[PDB]
Design an enzyme around this catalytic site. Structure first.
Site, short mmCIF file in Angstrom:
data_model
loop_
_atom_site.label_atom_id
_atom_site.label_comp_id
_atom_site.label_asym_id
_atom_site.label_seq_id
_atom_site.Cartn_x
_atom_site.Cartn_y
_atom_site.Cartn_z
CG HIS A 1 -0.40 0.23 2.54
ND1 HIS A 1 -0.28 -0.84 3.40
CD2 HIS A 1 0.17 1.29 3.17
CE1 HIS A 1 0.28 -0.43 4.53
NE2 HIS A 1 0.59 0.84 4.40
N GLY B 1 3.37 5.39 10.25
CA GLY B 1 4.74 5.25 9.79
C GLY B 1 5.41 3.94 10.14
CB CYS C 1 3.38 0.14 7.28
SG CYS C 1 1.71 0.32 7.88
C1 I69 Z 1 1.33 2.06 8.06
O1 I69 Z 1 2.44 2.75 8.66
C2 I69 Z 1 0.01 2.18 8.82
C3 I69 Z 1 0.13 1.76 10.28
C4 I69 Z 1 -1.10 2.09 11.13
C5 I69 Z 1 -1.30 3.58 11.44
C6 I69 Z 1 -1.88 3.59 12.85
N1 I69 Z 1 -1.44 2.34 13.44
C7 I69 Z 1 -1.01 1.49 12.52
O2 I69 Z 1 -0.57 0.37 12.73
N2 I69 Z 1 -0.98 1.38 8.09
C8 I69 Z 1 -1.97 2.00 7.47
O3 I69 Z 1 -2.14 3.21 7.51
C9 I69 Z 1 -2.95 1.16 6.69
C10 I69 Z 1 -2.80 1.41 5.17
C11 I69 Z 1 -4.25 1.16 4.79
C12 I69 Z 1 -4.68 -0.06 3.98
C13 I69 Z 1 -4.64 1.32 3.32
C14 I69 Z 1 -5.15 1.80 5.85
N3 I69 Z 1 -4.33 1.48 7.03
C15 I69 Z 1 -4.75 1.43 8.30
O4 I69 Z 1 -4.08 0.92 9.19
C16 I69 Z 1 -6.13 1.99 8.59
N4 I69 Z 1 -6.95 0.95 9.20
C17 I69 Z 1 -8.06 0.54 8.60
O5 I69 Z 1 -8.55 1.24 7.71
N5 I69 Z 1 -8.59 -0.59 9.04
C18 I69 Z 1 -9.82 -1.24 8.56
C19 I69 Z 1 -9.92 -1.23 7.03
C20 I69 Z 1 -11.02 -0.59 9.22
C21 I69 Z 1 -9.74 -2.70 9.01
C22 I69 Z 1 -6.11 3.24 9.47
C23 I69 Z 1 -5.61 2.97 10.89
C24 I69 Z 1 -5.24 4.31 8.82
C25 I69 Z 1 -7.53 3.79 9.59
#
Ligand code: I69
Ligand code: I69
Lengths: 306, 306
Positions: free
Chosen positions: B41, B143, B145
């Protein structure tokens, strides 16, 4: 989000650990520049440990008595001295992996990361606090002496602890890197005992702020308390007194959450007086006291190190 | 003695972490030989995250769109591919710090160490388990990920997890290093939810053996139970079923302590039915389930790694 007992990354310290063997004793040493630091009871024998005279013991030693393994390599000892309860072995090679570092003697209540080692090889890393009674609740087996505790600040390793011994209650005692014991302990096998521990009040409050930052609010109330009336409850539950200085340190966290320090004290008061009623905080059924206010801000904001 | 949540030494993994920036997204990558692995992503934008078609998204990209920082250095991307939900960036320099390593996809119940990173820089290390519902209870901010989870076995790093996302309950979901999610989760922002977690029964028994090894015995009894009758109690308390295979795995610990596996099951049964009556086990007021039988034997016997 989430909240975990988090240690510092251990790589800068791993590159410093060596094996020190002398006679029948094997333990760990810390290799920084051209010196290897290790507990002085490495000079002792199985009958020496009773009431040894280390100055007598050390004068009988020769450099070649000290076998120093850095992985798959002899380091040659070219000199040796004793500073308090640590031994300093001068070796003919400077450690090329020597990080930027400092030696610090920490106050009770402060936390650090321990890299547990055997035979000069790292086994694991975990987070500890210096208890108010100057023990640490570690995880240490035979051979672990000379394992160190440390904090990291940007790129600088601050060494604060070196492991020496285990007390009959299963807790641990050791020195700073200049060889001074934390607490009243000595490195000889005589009757010693911890003496009464207490809970680190300012850390418990920091952890309650962590819980709020992470969405646990069930324990908040609209009450408040004065500092004096809080400390009256603290002493009943064997908690350390909370000073105005602690209150100041908790300022950033209070400002981030919107919960005045003395309001959080009112919440701790009711948790002390009522227990938790089957509920948990940050996955714990006990009030956690081995996170400092700085630990909470580090982990809830995401600070790194190179 | 003592018993702590212990992570593996993180040095071998620290030397692999890099920063990957593309467009407005910055996250972590894992640099092994001449490939950098990171969540796919990273190609997404703030409006892409809804229901993206990553194959379409990736074909629009050029190598030069991917900015890869290894400390203070540009790594040039010379190729890129997608495997499941991970992106593999071919770079023109092999990582000289590449450890001996393997990619493994772990079973629920298994534990690993997480090196949390931001901007390619390590922040901290802690120990996790893969929950039965294939989430992990991590500590992760924006950040983080591309931070990885791992085990170490003598000198070999087994990478098992890469962080992708946070679920609304504050728990975390991610993939193996081949990009396959653990559990039913997908990397798009649609309704997803964990679904009901359960306690890892075999790990709780392992931790009770750790407690005995370390001198907590207050919870033992002379009762015993059959496997069937134990599992009848397990299901009532939302514990996973204990299989004969679990029983076999607990053999070494049973042999060291002298306490037959099914006798320890009788003790867990009474702790489930009675609670702890104000008492603690290994410093916990809850029954701990994120230590495997192997974790207990490692820490109670002192195994190292180079
Ligand atoms: C990457 O660094 C980040 C880590 C998150 C940020 C807060 N705590 C964490 O572990 N990951 C993300 O931002 C990912 C990327 C995507 C797929 C596009 C969204 N995302 C999220 O973690 C979302 N979570 C969700 O949308 N979860 C669902 C779909 C409801 C299950 C948020 C936390 C940014 C909303
Ligand atoms: C060094 O590797 C070792 C680590 C111990 C072994 C078990 N767990 C540990 O942390 N340290 C020692 O063996 C030191 C060396 C001395 C001073 C000479 C004894 N010692 C001990 O830890 C003693 N403990 C005590 O004797 N404690 C007092 C004196 C009763 C307080 C034991 C554990 C070997 C008995």
């Amino acid at each position: 989000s989430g909240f975990r007992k988090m240690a510092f990354p251990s790589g800068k310290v791993e590159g410093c650990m060596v094996q020190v063997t002398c006679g029948t004793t094997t333990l760990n040493g810390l290799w920084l520049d051209d010196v290897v630091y290790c507990p002085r009871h490495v000079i002792c024998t199985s009958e020496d440990m009773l009431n040894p005279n280390y100055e007598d013991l050390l004068i009988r030693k020769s450099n070649h008595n000290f076998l120093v393994q850095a992985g798959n390599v002899q380091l040659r000892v070219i000199g040796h001295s004793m500073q308090n309860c640590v031994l300093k072995l001068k070796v003919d090679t400077a450690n090329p992996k020597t990080p930027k570092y400092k030696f610090v003697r920490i106050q009770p209540g402060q936390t650090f990361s321990v890299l547990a080692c055997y035979n000069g090889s790292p086994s694991g890393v975990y987070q500890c606090a210096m208890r108010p009674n100057f023990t640490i609740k570690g995880s240490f087996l035979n051979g672990s002496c000379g394992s160190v505790g440390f904090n990291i600040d940007y790129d600088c390793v601050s060494f604060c602890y070196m492991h020496h011994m285990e007390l009959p209650t299963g807790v641990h005692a050791g020195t700073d890197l200049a060889g001074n014991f934390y607490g009243p302990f000595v490195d000889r096998q005589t009757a010693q005992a911890a003496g009464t521990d207490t809970t680190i009040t300012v850390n418990v409050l920091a952890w309650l702020y962590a819980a709020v930052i992470n969405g646990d609010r069930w324990f908040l109330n609209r009450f408040t308390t004065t500092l004096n009336d809080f400390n009256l409850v603290a002493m009943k539950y064997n908690y350390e007194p909370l000073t105005q200085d602690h209150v100041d340190i908790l300022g950033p966290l209070s400002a981030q959450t919107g919960i005045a320090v003395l309001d959080m004290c009112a919440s701790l008061k009711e948790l002390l007086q009522n227990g938790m009623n089957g509920r948990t905080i940050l996955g714990s059924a006990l009030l956690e006291d081995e996170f400092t206010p700085f630990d909470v801000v580090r982990q809830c904001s995401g600070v790194t190190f190179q």
